[PDB]
Structure 1
Amino acid sequence: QVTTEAPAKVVKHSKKQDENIVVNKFKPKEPYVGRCLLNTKITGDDAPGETWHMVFSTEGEVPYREGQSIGIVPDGIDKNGKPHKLRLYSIASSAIGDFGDSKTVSLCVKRLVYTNDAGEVVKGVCSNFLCDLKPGSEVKITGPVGKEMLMPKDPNATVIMLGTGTGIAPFRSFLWKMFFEKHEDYQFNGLAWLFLGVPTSSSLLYKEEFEKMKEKAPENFRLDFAVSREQVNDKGEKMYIQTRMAQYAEELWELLKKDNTFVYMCGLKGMEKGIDDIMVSLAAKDGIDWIEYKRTLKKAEQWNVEVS
């Protein structure tokens, strides 16, 4: 008698792809050092700000999956001669990545530029270091991090993706795995519906890629853009993400009542409210309380949020 079955720890059941997931392999103490393969501006010269897509070599050392983030320790020192703290960035590439070899990682980065009260133009440290990164240069990577935005295991589930700006990143990751890749253990056949809010047409992130996916899965891939500074509803209201969702109120509510519907939200912290305003009305007319219904969804792993 050399064996025994040690009593199992009690554990919560998960509908998301978390089998053998990995977080915090690399710490800022000793980050993984990768290199820049490419770094391109994906927004028009005319857009209000610049958004860049960049790819780094990982030689397969960072075991990330769709929905996770990585931290970046930008080169340099702060005002006190100290190294910079890491900044997190949502992975914009699928697990196998942009080269299809599982040895790279991609980021979608907004270059932060603003002016303080003193009237001075200020440049965000990490975002400007990243957008200025030249191919061939090293970059310090930490993580992976996150489990909230992991994809659902069900290959026939409806996945509603709500994003603003660079919040599109994890959704480009999901969609590549869903429509640009042939997976043995996972071939997507549900409904993927993406809503993306950006300020202008020159700001439509990954427009061409999404159009190729629509042209490849015209039935089960739905795409709706909400261009806030160019589009307007019948009342002249700016077309924010919730304003566009409003045009499909009946359908979305109907999907939200389905048990295989998962909603994911990523991007601006403020997008969360307009969406709830929209939802509270629908549930109301349906004699349902969104407050309570949302709680259920969240506990059922069907209302996933990662905003900041």
Structure 2
Amino acid sequence: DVPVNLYRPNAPFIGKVISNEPLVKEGGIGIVQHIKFDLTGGNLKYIEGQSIGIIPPGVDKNGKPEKLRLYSIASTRHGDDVDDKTISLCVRQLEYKHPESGETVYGVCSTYLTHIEPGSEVKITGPVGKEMLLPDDPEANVIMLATGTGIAPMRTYLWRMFKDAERAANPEYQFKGFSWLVFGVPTTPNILYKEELEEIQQKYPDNFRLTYAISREQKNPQGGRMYIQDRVAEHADQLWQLIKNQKTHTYICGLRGMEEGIDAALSAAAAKEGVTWSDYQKDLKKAGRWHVETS
């Protein structure tokens, strides 16, 4: 019943950009844009936790057409306007100074996307992925560990769980469990979707907990900059206690090099009860309750 590959690279769906808005506020590091595309005219359907491909125009340095780049869907299946007519992405402009000598490098697809104008036609493929799907059980617990744009799939979950319009549109899913997002970014201006995330926590204090790891504004107990692995270590016992529930699911996105720190913290917590985390975790993965998507 899960939609998959309704459109492929050889015959992509040609969508139209509706809006391209900045998510990084003044004083933040980098550029991250929220881009919404019109899906009318096609049959692209999708669910929370999936991704779509974007095929940028142009050729690479070898003269070959550019290939698709995958992006985690940032909107629920109904789209940001809950009209089942759009899809949104959370795109960071990739930019890095080339080693040994000044000159900055700009990622092809991400720069194309972050600077795209409303009305422009875009080649879209997908949806893709069955690794980050949300359980249908409204009483499940959901732990979300994310950094930067890794917030994308989490937004799809949280919006479906807590937006008034979503709850009205999803009679079959009235979330009543507990969800906890631990979000790591460099600055407060970099907290993507800050206002809406905090709105949700204020409205659902018993169903949603929000924890930040802001590196340029906070220090861990050792004096270093605060990162997501530090927050997990800080709340290791609480997280492990939740993970023990047969209905708890954990989602990780964007922790390229944080996963090891995460496991170290949970391992120490589980060890107190004579449990080897690495083994317990392997079983969670097999059971489909430990979801990971890092790149």
TM-score (norm 1): 0.91
The answer to whether the Cα contact below 8 Å between 2:182 and 2:210 also exists between their aligned partners in 1 is yes
Please, which of 205, 209, 217 is the counterpart of residue 218 of structure 1? Answer: 205
Instruction: Find the counterpart in structure 2 of residue 4 from structure 1.
Output: none
The answer to whether the Cα contact below 8 Å between 1:164 and 1:271 also exists between their aligned partners in 2 is no
Show CA shifts across 1:179-231 (max 9, x none): 00111111111001111110111211100010111122121111001112221
Name the CA distance, whole Å, in 1 between partners of 2:255 and 2:141. Answer: 23
Instruction: Find the counterpart in structure 2 of residue 42 from structure 1.
Output: 23
Please, which of 196, 217, 224 is the counterpart of residue 183 of structure 2? Answer: 196
Please, which of 260, 270, 275 is the counterpart of residue 288 of structure 1? Answer: 275
Name the CA distance, whole Å, in 1 between partners of 2:180 and 2:6. Answer: 32
Please, which of 259, 282, 306 is the counterpart of residue 246 of structure 2? Answer: 259
Name the CA distance, whole Å, in 2 between partners of 1:285 and 1:101. Answer: 49
Q: Counterpart amino acid of 1:205?
A: L
Matches within 5 A, 1:99-248: 99-117=81-99, 119=101, 120-180=103-163, 181-182=166-167, 183-248=170-235
Cα-Cα RMSD? 1.2
Instruction: Find the counterpart in structure 1 of residue 74 from structure 2.
Output: 92
Shift in Å, 1:61: 2.0
Name the CA distance, whole Å, in 2 between partners of 1:63 and 1:291. Answer: 36
Which sits farther off after the overlay, 173-182 or 80-89?
A: 80-89
The answer to whether the Cα contact below 8 Å between 2:220 and 2:230 also exists between their aligned partners in 1 is yes
Name the CA distance, whole Å, in 2 between partners of 1:117 and 1:240. Answer: 25
Shift in Å, 1:118: 5.1
The answer to whether the Cα contact below 8 Å between 1:61 and 1:103 also exists between their aligned partners in 2 is no
1:64 and 2:51 aligned? no
Unaligned runs of 5+ in 1: 1-19
Show CA shifts across 1:26-82 (max 9, x none): 111111000111101110242221111110001162111000000000122222332
Which sits farther off after the overlay, 292-301 or 73-82?
A: 73-82
Name the CA distance, whole Å, in 2 between partners of 1:67 and 1:304. Answer: 10
Name the CA distance, whole Å, in 2 between partners of 1:234 and 1:267. Answer: 23
SS in 1 for 2:152: helix
1:79 and 2:61 aligned? yes
Q: Percent of pairs identical after alignment?
A: 54
Which sits farther off after the overlay, 236-245 or 151-160?
A: 236-245
Name the CA distance, whole Å, in 2 between partners of 1:283 and 1:216. Answer: 32
Count residues in correspondence: 289
Instruction: Find the counterpart in structure 2 of residue 297 from structure 1.
Output: 284
Which sits farther off after the overlay, 74-83 or 260-269?
A: 74-83
Name the CA distance, whole Å, in 2 between partners of 1:52 and 1:210. Answer: 17
The answer to whether the Cα contact below 8 Å between 2:237 and 2:266 also exists between their aligned partners in 1 is no
Name the CA distance, whole Å, in 2 between partners of 1:237 and 1:140. Answer: 43
Name the CA distance, whole Å, in 2 between partners of 1:194 and 1:291. Answer: 22
